[PDB]
Amino acid sequence: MKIKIVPAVGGGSPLELEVAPNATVGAVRTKVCAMKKLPPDTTRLTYKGRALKDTETLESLGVADGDKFVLITRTVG
Structure with missing residues (x-):
């Protein structure tokens, strides 16, 4: 149960963390x-x-171990 999220911070770097997609997207x-x-x-x-x-769980859409998600961040303030 591992997930890799690569932040799109202009050449950012991927990070490995332990999370469950069958819980909540926002979480x-x-x-x-x-x-x-x-x-x-x-x-x-x-x-x-x-x-x-709001999908909450991702299993309904197709959950897999070792998946990869894209994290985006905008510059504001």
């Missing part, structure tokens, strides 16, 4: 964002070319 996105110390207010997540959030 996972917030967990990875915090680990990288990024702005949660202006942050999005894309999986399989699709944006999830």
Whole structure:
């Protein structure tokens, strides 16, 4: 049960963390964002070319061990 999220911070670096996609989208996105110390207010997540959030679980859409999610962050303030 491992997931790899690569932040799109202009040449950013991928980070490995332990999260469950069968729990909540916002929970996972917030967990990875915090680990990288990024702005949660202006942050999005894309999986399989699709944006999830209220979906809660990802198993219904197809959960896999060792998947990869894309983390985006905008510059604001």
